[PDB]
Amino acid sequence: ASPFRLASAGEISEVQGILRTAGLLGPEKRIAYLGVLDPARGAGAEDRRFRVFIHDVSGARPQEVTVSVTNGTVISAVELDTAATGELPVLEEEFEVVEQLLATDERWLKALAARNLDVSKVRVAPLSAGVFEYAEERGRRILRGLAFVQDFPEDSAWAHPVDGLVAYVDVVSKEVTRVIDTGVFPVPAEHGNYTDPELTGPLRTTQKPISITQPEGPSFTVTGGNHIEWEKWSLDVGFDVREGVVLHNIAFRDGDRLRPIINRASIAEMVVPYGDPSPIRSWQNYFDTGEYLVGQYANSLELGCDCLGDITYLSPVISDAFGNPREIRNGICMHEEDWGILAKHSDLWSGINYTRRNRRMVISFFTTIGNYDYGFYWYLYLDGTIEFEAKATGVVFTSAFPEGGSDNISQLAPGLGAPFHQHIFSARLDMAIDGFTNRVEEEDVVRQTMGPGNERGNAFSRKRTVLTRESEAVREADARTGRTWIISNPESKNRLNEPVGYKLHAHNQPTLLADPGSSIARRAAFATKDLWVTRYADDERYPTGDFVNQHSGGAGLPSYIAQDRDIDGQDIVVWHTFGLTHFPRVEDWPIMPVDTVGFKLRPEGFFDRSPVLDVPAN
Amino acid sequence: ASPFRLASAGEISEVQGILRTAGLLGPEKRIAYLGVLDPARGAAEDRRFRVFIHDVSGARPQEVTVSVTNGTVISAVELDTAATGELPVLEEEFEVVEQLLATDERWLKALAARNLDVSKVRVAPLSAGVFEYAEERGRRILRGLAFVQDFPEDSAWAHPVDGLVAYVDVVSKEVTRVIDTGVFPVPAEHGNYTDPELTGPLRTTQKPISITQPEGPSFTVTGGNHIEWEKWSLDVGFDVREGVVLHNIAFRDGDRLRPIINRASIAEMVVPYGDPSPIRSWQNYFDTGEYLVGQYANSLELGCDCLGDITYLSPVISDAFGNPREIRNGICMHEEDWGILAKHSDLWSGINYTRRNRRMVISFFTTIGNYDYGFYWYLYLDGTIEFEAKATGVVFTSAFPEGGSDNISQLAPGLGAPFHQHIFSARLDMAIDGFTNRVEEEDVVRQTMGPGNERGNAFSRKRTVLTRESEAVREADARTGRTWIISNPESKNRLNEPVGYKLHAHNQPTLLADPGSSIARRAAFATKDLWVTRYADDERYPTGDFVNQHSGGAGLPSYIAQDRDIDGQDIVVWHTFGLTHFPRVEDWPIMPVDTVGFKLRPEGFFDRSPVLDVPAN
Numbered sequence A: 001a002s003p004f005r006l007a008s009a010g011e012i013s014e015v016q017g018i019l020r021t022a023g024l025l026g027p028e029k030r031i032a033y034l035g036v037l038d039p040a041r042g043a044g045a046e047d048r049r050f051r052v053f054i055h056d057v058s059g060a061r062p063q064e065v066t067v068s069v070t071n072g073t074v075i076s077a078v079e080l081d082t083a084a085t086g087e088l089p090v091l092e093e094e095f096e097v098v099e100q101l102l103a104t105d106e107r108w109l110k111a112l113a114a115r116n117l118d119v120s121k122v123r124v125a126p127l128s129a130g131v132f133e134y135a136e137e138r139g140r141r142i143l144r145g146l147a148f149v150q151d152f153p154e155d156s157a158w159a160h161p162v163d164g165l166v167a168y169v170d171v172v173s174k175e176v177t178r179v180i181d182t183g184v185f186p187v188p189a190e191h192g193n194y195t196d197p198e199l200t201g202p203l204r205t206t207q208k209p210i211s212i213t214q215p216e217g218p219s220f221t222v223t224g225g226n227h228i229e230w231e232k233w234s235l236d237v238g239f240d241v242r243e244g245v246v247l248h249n250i251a252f253r254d255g256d257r258l259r260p261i262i263n264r265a266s267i268a269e270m271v272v273p274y275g276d277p278s279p280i281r282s283w284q285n286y287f288d289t290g291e292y293l294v295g296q297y298a299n300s301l302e303l304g305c306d307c308l309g310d311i312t313y314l315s316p317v318i319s320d321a322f323g324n325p326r327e328i329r330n331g332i333c334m335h336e337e338d339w340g341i342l343a344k345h346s347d348l349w350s351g352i353n354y355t356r357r358n359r360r361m362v363i364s365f366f367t368t369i370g371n372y373d374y375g376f377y378w379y380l381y382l383d384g385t386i387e388f389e390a391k392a393t394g395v396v397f398t399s400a401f402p403e404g405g406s407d408n409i410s411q412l413a414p415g416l417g418a419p420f421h422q423h424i425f426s427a428r429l430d431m432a433i434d435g436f437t438n439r440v441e442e443e444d445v446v447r448q449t450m451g452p453g454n455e456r457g458n459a460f461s462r463k464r465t466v467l468t469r470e471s472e473a474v475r476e477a478d479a480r481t482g483r484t485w486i487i488s489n490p491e492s493k494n495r496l497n498e499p500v501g502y503k504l505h506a507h508n509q510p511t512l513l514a515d516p517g518s519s520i521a522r523r524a525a526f527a528t529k530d531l532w533v534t535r536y537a538d539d540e541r542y543p544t545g546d547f548v549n550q551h552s553g554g555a556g557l558p559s560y561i562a563q564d565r566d567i568d569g570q571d572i573v574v575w576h577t578f579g580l581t582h583f584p585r586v587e588d589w590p591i592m593p594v595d596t597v598g599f600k601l602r603p604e605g606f607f608d609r610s611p612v613l614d615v616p617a618n
Numbered sequence B: 001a002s003p004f005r006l007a008s009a010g011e012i013s014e015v016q017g018i019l020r021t022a023g024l025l026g027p028e029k030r031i032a033y034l035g036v037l038d039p040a041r042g043a044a045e046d047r048r049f050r051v052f053i054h055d056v057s058g059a060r061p062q063e064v065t066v067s068v069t070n071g072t073v074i075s076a077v078e079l080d081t082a083a084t085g086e087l088p089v090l091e092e093e094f095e096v097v098e099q100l101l102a103t104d105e106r107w108l109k110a111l112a113a114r115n116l117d118v119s120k121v122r123v124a125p126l127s128a129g130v131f132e133y134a135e136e137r138g139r140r141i142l143r144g145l146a147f148v149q150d151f152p153e154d155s156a157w158a159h160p161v162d163g164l165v166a167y168v169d170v171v172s173k174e175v176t177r178v179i180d181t182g183v184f185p186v187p188a189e190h191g192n193y194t195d196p197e198l199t200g201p202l203r204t205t206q207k208p209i210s211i212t213q214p215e216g217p218s219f220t221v222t223g224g225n226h227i228e229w230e231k232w233s234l235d236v237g238f239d240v241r242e243g244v245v246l247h248n249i250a251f252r253d254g255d256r257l258r259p260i261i262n263r264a265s266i267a268e269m270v271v272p273y274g275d276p277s278p279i280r281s282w283q284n285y286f287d288t289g290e291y292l293v294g295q296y297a298n299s300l301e302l303g304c305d306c307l308g309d310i311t312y313l314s315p316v317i318s319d320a321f322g323n324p325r326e327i328r329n330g331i332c333m334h335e336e337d338w339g340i341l342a343k344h345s346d347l348w349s350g351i352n353y354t355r356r357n358r359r360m361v362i363s364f365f366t367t368i369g370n371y372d373y374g375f376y377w378y379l380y381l382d383g384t385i386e387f388e389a390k391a392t393g394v395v396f397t398s399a400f401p402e403g404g405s406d407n408i409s410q411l412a413p414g415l416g417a418p419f420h421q422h423i424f425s426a427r428l429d430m431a432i433d434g435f436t437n438r439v440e441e442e443d444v445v446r447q448t449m450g451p452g453n454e455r456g457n458a459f460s461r462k463r464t465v466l467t468r469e470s471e472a473v474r475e476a477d478a479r480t481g482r483t484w485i486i487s488n489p490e491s492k493n494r495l496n497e498p499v500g501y502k503l504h505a506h507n508q509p510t511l512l513a514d515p516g517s518s519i520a521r522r523a524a525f526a527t528k529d530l531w532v533t534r535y536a537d538d539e540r541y542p543t544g545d546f547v548n549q550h551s552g553g554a555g556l557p558s559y560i561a562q563d564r565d566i567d568g569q570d571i572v573v574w575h576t577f578g579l580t581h582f583p584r585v586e587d588w589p590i591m592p593v594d595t596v597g598f599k600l601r602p603e604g605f606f607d608r609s610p611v612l613d614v615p616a617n
C-alpha cells in the first residue's frame, strides 16, 4: 500500500474529525487549504500526515495545523500573524462577496449611476490585492474589484469592462474600504458570445471524424490507485489543491534496475503580472497557484472532446471549506499517444531499412481561474525525455481601449482593450538522477578563434561550470550560446566512465519585465531569473513561500538561496522559471486559441546506448 | 489546368526530347539537376524547366532553360565552374571514390598499415569545399573517408578509419592526394541495431494505437496537387534540390481567398563540422545545395512512416539521362488531431465551451548517407503555419582520441562523434493579403519605475520597420522576445491596423565557425537569423545556384548589396534555424529524432478569432 497514494474521501473525513475532537474546527472556522504531506526522506510503517490552513470567519487569527491521520492526532497547531507571514489563500466562498458588498455601497452605486449601469447586471471579479501604499490593509484580508457588465444571464461579461473604476473590500469585516473613480470610459458594447450564431456564422460542416482507439487497451497499468507503469517508466500521480497534478518517483527500468530520475515534479507557482500603468489596473498580479489554488478549480473533463482516445481518469478528492470531501470527477487524464517517428535510417551500404515509431505517456488536468483556463500536461517519451507543457486559453482580461491608443494595451474590438501581461510558471524539480547525490552544471557553447590548432576556423566546443553553492545558483538564459543546465550524479558513471545526467532545455522566453524595484519583482522574485538551484529542505515547497496573498516580498527562493548551502553532490532541487509574454491580438477575441510554453529534460549520458533499441517494428 | 501542378513523366521525357533535338543531350551528357520553374509574376501557360547538364568527357557544363509547352530552348549558357561553382554531386559519382581508391598504391599502403582488407572498406563520397589546394579549382573533386564493413549487413559507421583521407577527381578519374597522419585504432564494437544481441528481447508491452477516418479525410486533392482543407488553400510542389515546396498558401476568410505566403521552401541546409583535425576540418555538407535532398526522398511505407488516413503524392524527377523516375509515395499528406483549440468554463454565464484543434501535415523524409531527415509543414485551424525538421539516422563517426577531446564526444569504446550543426534556411516569399508587404522587428520594451509608471509594472514593445535590404540582416534576441512581423501596409483589419503574421523563431545558435573561415563565407546566410530581400526571380537560394566547390561571391550577401526598397514591396524572408549537436551516448547506434523549426501566427490578420465556426466534437 503506497505512501504516495492519493488522499481518500475517508482520510479527509478523518482530518475533519480529528480537527473536531481536537477542538479547532467549529462553525466560523473554514479550511483555506488542505493537502497530504509527502513522506520524509528515508522513512519508507507509513504515517499519513495532512497540513491544513484554517481561516476564522469570526475574525480570530488563522491557524496552520498538521494532523496525523494514521494515529488520529494533531501533530502541531500554530496561530498565524498574517501581517508578518501573509494572508491565507483566497476562499471560493469569497468569490461573490466583493460584488454583494459593493451592490449596496453609495460610492459604488453613484459610479454605476453616472455610467447608467444597472447594478443587477454588474459582475465584480474578486481580485487579489497585493501589497502597495495602503497602510490600513496590513493584517487585513482585502480583495479588489473590477466591474464587468453582463447584459443577460448567458452573456459574456468580459466584453463589457467598466474602466476608470475600482473598489477595495475587507472580506472579514464586510466593509468597503475604498472606491476609486478616475473618470468615465465608454463601456464597450459589442458582445463576445462565441456560441451565438450571429457571431459564429454557420458552423463548419467540413470536418470529418478522426477516430483514435486502442482495441487491446492501453500499454500502461494503474495500480494502487495512482501508480503508473508504462514502457520502462514508473511513477506516482499525486494531486494537491494548490499545485494540481504532482508527479512522484519518476524512474526508468534500465534492464533490471529501477533508476530514479526525478523525485518530485510540480508547478509550484504561477503568476500573471499586468503591464498597464493605469491606477485602475497597475496593482494587478494574479498568483493563480499560490493565491487562488489551481488544483481546487480543476475541470471535470469529458470524453471525446477534452481527452481523445483510450483514457484512464483519476478522480481526485479534495476538502471543501468545512472539511467535507469533494471529488473532482475525471479531473486527471492519463493516456498514451503516437508521437511520429522515433528513429529511422535507410543504409546504402548494409541494405537495411529501419523505422520505429515514438509514443508518449500524457498525464494532464485543466483548470479555470476566472477568465483564464489552463491545461497542464506532463509527457514521458520512449527515449527517456520528460516534458511539461502549459496550454493557455479562456477569455482575455479586458479594459477600455483609450482614445488615441496605448503603449500598454491592445485593441480587440471597438473601444475594447486587453492590457499587456505575462503568464510565468515555476517548475519545482526535486531531482534524483540515479539517486539523490546530484549536481548542476551550466553548459554554454564555446566559439573558437581561427589560428594555431584551428587553422581553418571551424572548431567549436562547449564548457560546463558546476554550481557549487546556492549563492552561485541563480542563473539566466543565454539562447545565443545555447545555454542549458545538466543535472548529474557524480558518483554514478555510465559505461564510458562519464557521470550520468539529464539536460534541461528551456524555451528562453522573456522573464519578469517589471522594474526590479517593483512590488511584483519582490513578491515574484523567482520570475526574474530562469534557473534556481537549492539544497532540499522539507519546508521549502514554493518559490513564493507558504502564504503569498498580501505578503510583502522576499519570501521563498531569495530567502532560501541566502542560506548558501552546498549543492555540489547533494540532495538538490531545480526551479525553472518559464512563461508567456502576451500582447493580446484581435485573434484572441472573443475566446483565445491555445498558446503554449514549457520545457523538457533529455538524457545526457544517462544510458549506455539508445534506450529504445528494443522497441519493435510497428 | 493549374500551372503549379507537379511535373509529369511526359514533361520530363519531353525536356529530354527538346534537349536532344537541340544537340545539348548527347551520350557524354548527364542531367545533374532538372526542375520546373514557377510561373512569372502576373502570368496562357508556359511550363519552363531549368537544367544543369554535366559532361563526363571533361567539356564545360551548361545551364539550360527549356519551354516544354513550346518545344524550345529559351537559353543555354556554358559555365566556367572555377568562377561560378561546380554542378551538384551526381549520384553515379558516389561509388567512384571507393572504386578509384581500391587500386591506388598510397591508399592500399594506408589500409595495409591498419591490417584492413580493401574489400571491406567503404568510402564515403564527401563534398570537398574550397580550401588551400590550388589544383582543385575548376575540377570536380570528392573527398573520401573510410569505414570498415565486417560483412554485407554490417553498419560501417561503427568502424571509422581515422587519420586517413583521400581526394579524388571524379571526371579524370584520378586520385589527387592521400593523406595518412597516423594509425588510430578502428573501433571494434558493432552498431547493428537489428542484431538481437544488441537490442535484447524486443518489447511485447506496446499495445496497438489505431488512427482511422471512417468518412475519409477532411481535405480534398484536385489537379494532382491542390489541397483544400479547413479554409486553407495551397499547391504542393516538389523539386529535386529543395524537396517539398508549398505554393500559394491562402486562407478563405468568409467569401475572400486571402493570400499569406506565395512560396515556402527549405532553400538550403548545411552541416558544418567542428573538429579541427586535418582529417575532418574541411567537412561541411550542403545537403540541399550540393547533394539535392529531394532526389533522395524515401518511399514511405503505409502504416509505419505515416500513420492514419494518408494521401500520398508520387513526384517524378529526372535520372542522369533525362528519363523520368517516380518517387513512389514520396510525399505524405494527412490531417491529425491536435488537442484543445479553445476552452472556457464561465462562472457568470454558466456556459462551458471546448473545441478541438487539428493540423494538416505535408511531409517527406530523405536519406543523405548516414543522415535521415523528415521535413514537415503544418497548417492549423487557427491560421498558424509551422515547419519542423526531424533529424535522425546514424551519427557521423571518428576515432575517440586517447585522453579526450574538446571537439568530439565518446559513443562507445574508441568511437567518437565530432561536434557539428545542422542549419536550415527557410525561404518564405511572403504575400500577406497580396504582395505589398513589409517587415518589422518587434522587441519587448522594459520600462523604468517613475512618472507615468509609479508602481514599476509597465511594459511595452517597439516595432522597427526594415526599409531597405541594407537594414534587413537581423539577429535573434531571445531575452527581449524578438520576433518579426510581416504586414501589408495597404490592407487594414476592422480595427484600422495593418494585417500581419508574426514569425516566432526558436532562437537556437547560428553558425559557430570563425567569421574568417571558408564555411562562414560559403554559408554566410547561416551567420544571421533573419534576412529580407526584394523578390527577384533568379534569387532562389541563399548560397546561389552552384554551391559545390564554390567560394563566396553569390547568394544572400550579393543580393543584399543591391539595397533595394522592401517597405511595401514584394519581399522574401529567409530564416536561418538549426540544431547544434554535441552527440550523446543515447544517439548511438541509431539516433532518436531531434527537432527544430519555426512558426508564423496571425497578428491582426483576422477581425476576430477565425475558429468561432468550429463545431463541438
Ligand SMILES: [Cu+2]
Pocket (backbone or CB within 6 Å): A392, A421, A422, A423, A582
Ligand atoms: Cu494572456
Ligand SMILES: [Cu+2]
Pocket (backbone or CB within 6 Å): B391, B420, B421, B422, B581
Ligand atoms: Cu547531428
Ligand code: NA
Pocket (backbone or CB within 6 Å): A263, A430, A431, A432, A436, A438, A536, A571, A572, A573
Ligand atoms: Na533532490
Ligand code: NA
Pocket (backbone or CB within 6 Å): B262, B429, B430, B431, B435, B535, B569, B570, B571, B572
Ligand atoms: Na513576396
